[PDB]
Design a protein around this ligand. Structure first.
Ligand SMILES: *C(=O)CCCCCCCCCCCN
Length: 13
């Protein structure tokens, strides 16, 4: 619900 785009590579950022 809009999270995979939060750790797209920034390891949760
Ligand atoms: C999409 O969101 C799939 C995984 C769930 C992550 C969100 C947790 C719910 C609590 C509020 C934080 C913002 N969605």
């Amino acid at each position: 619900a809009l999270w995979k785009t939060l750790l797209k590579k920034v390891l949760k950022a």
